[PDB]
Amino acid sequence: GSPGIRLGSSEDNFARFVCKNNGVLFENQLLQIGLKSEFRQNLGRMFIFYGNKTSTQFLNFTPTLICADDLQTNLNLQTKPVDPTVDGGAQVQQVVNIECISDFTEAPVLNIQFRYGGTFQNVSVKLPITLNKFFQPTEMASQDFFQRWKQLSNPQQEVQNIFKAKHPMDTEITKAKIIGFGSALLEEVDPNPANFVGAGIIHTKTTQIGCLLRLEPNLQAQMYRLTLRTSKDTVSQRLCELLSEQF
Amino acid sequence: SDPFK
Numbered sequence: 001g002s003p004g005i006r007l008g009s010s011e012d013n014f015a016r017f018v019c020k021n022n023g024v025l026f027e028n029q030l031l032q033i034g035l036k037s038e039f040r041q042n043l044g045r046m047f048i049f050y051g052n053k054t055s056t057q058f059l060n061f062t063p064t065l066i067c068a069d070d071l072q073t074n075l076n077l078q079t080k081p082v083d084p085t086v087d088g089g090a091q092v093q094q095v096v097n098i099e100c101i102s103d104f105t106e107a108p109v110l111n112i113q114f115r116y117g118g119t120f121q122n123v124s125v126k127l128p129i130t131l132n133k134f135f136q137p138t139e140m141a142s143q144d145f146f147q148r149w150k151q152l153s154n155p156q157q158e159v160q161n162i163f164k165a166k167h168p169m170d171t172e173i174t175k176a177k178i179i180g181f182g183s184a185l186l187e188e189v190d191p192n193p194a195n196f197v198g199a200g201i202i203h204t205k206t207t208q209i210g211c212l213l214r215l216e217p218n219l220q221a222q223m224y225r226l227t228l229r230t231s232k233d234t235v236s237q238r239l240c241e242l243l244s245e246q247f
Numbered sequence: 248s249d250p251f252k
Contacts, residue, residue: 146251
């Protein structure tokens with residue numbers, strides 16, 4: 001995607017917030033933006049923490065959430081005004097109430113405008129609300145898994161990606177990443193114990209999408225094969241896109 | 248053999 005160096009961009013740390021909800025999204029020399037989020041069903045609550053790293057107040061501090069056109073239809077975000085004056089060394093919080101209307105690919109933009117020393121300060125960063133946040137894990141027995149796997153009918157509902165590892169292929173980190181992504185992590189389904197299997201339901205207002213995945217590490221080749229099978233083509237695509245970036 | 252076909 002988007003060409004050129006991802007440093008000083010709107011998305012430097014986005015990928016660190018797909019399989020976890022808490023941490024520092026952005027930090028320049030004036031402002032730190034932290035996150036803490038929780039999701040249930042098709043809903044979420046995201047706390048955004050604005051930290052003034054300086055010894056002077058920020059004035060007219062105004063964070064705004066922007067959702068590009070298709071995103072508008074698929075994601076509803078509700079929030080309340082933040083106090084515009086932020087003391088040096090202080091933090092102010094914003095709470096963002098999230099409702100997923102239907103599956104979606106784009107991310108909202110958080111724009112922050114404030115005055116510091118009489119100067120106009122402007123920051124834009126992509127906010128890590130991603131489709132996998134709306135997962136319900138679904139534990140099930142291996143027989144039930146394979147019966148559902150083999151109900152795929154529409155070829156477009158199956159998406160596979162064979163890709164080079166970007167990170168060390170550590171077993172326990174991999175387990176943690178799948179659990180953080182949000183599906184159940186099913187053991188004793190793939191007879192090869194080195195592979196990972198997941199199952200869950202993506203919840204949206206209008207549609208519930210059942211999802212099955214398989215991750216096959218190839219340690220000597222430093223490669224993975226990821227397979228998504230779900231009840232909606234666009235969900236298989238976005239989940240494969242997201243998960244692939246994590247390994 | 249392979250339950251995934």
